[PDB]
């Protein structure tokens, strides 16, 4: 039912994301270790937990850019549009990738091979309850959709090619690039669950949810600033913290 062109398109996205992902696993013993045990009033341990998370965030941004560069169409856009689309999508793709790593049985997200954290751990990494509850809520709703690799890969490509992002100078081209991926996901979902026609809409609706969650994160970011910011340069640059 998938055309040969669609099978190839999807195979390459799934392979592109596996290649981007194994690059991250190469530099896992290079992230600040999560403090094992440690007195719960140690301010050094508090600092390490924050740094651990912001270093996982940096690896996530590297995976995202590395994947984007492999999505056909992406490198043919102007450089400034490439930047505009990546600046807007980064948080949203980070959250889709967090959702993919959620375990509903144990209610915990596993970053890289085996950095498994609960809500308590997100809070000890310096995150506020206003952001943590939605993240886990979104992850829980994504889990029930039961997305596979092809579906995540396609949804991410679709999310990157959102024409209405701020500062995109050629939205016509960007929207035109979104269409083959939307159509590939429409055909893929129709084959996987041919009885459930509302699965494809339910997935596109998550992109609506990701817009709100993007705002919730910007509030979290302005909240860090008013309490000892200390986000690394790549992260404070992308998310426009200083300029």
């Amino acid at each position: 039912q998938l055309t040969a062109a669609q099978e190839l398109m999807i195979q390459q996205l799934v392979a592109a994301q596996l290649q981007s992902n194994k690059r991250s696993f190469s530099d896992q013993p290079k992230v600040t270790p999560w403090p094992l045990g440690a007195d719960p009033q140690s301010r050094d341990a508090r600092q390490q937990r924050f740094a651990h998370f912001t270093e996982l965030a940096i690896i996530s941004v590297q995976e995202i850019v590395d994947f984007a560069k492999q999505v056909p169409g992406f490198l043919q856009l102007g450089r400034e549009d490439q930047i505009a689309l990546l600046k807007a999508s980064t948080i949203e793709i980070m959250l889709l990738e967090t959702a993919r790593r959620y375990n509903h049985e144990t209610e915990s997200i596993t970053f890289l091979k085996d950095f498994t954290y609960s809500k308590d751990d997100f809070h000890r990494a310096g995150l506020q309850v206003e952001f943590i509850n939605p993240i886990f809520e979104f992850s829980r709703a994504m889990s029930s959709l039961g997305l596979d690799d092809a579906e995540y890969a396609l949804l991410i490509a679709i999310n990157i090619f959102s024409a209405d992002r701020p500062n995109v100078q050629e939205p016509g081209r960007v929207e035109a690039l979104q269409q083959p991926y939307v159509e590939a996901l429409l055909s893929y979902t129709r084959i996987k669950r041919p009885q459930d026609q509302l699965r494809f809409p339910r997935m596109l609706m998550k992109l609506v949810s990701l817009r709100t969650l993007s705002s919730v994160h910007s509030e979290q970011v302005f909240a860090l600033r008013l309490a000892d910011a200390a986000l690394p340069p790549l992260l404070s640059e992308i998310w426009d913290v200083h300029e």
Binding site: V61, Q62, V65, D66, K69, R79, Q82, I83, L86, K87, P233, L234, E237, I238, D240, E243
Partner: peptide
């Protein structure tokens, strides 16, 4: 903005 660090990642 220059976005120097994102550009660096895009370059290689």
């Amino acid at each position: 903005k220059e976005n120097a660090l994102l550009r660096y990642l895009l370059d290689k």
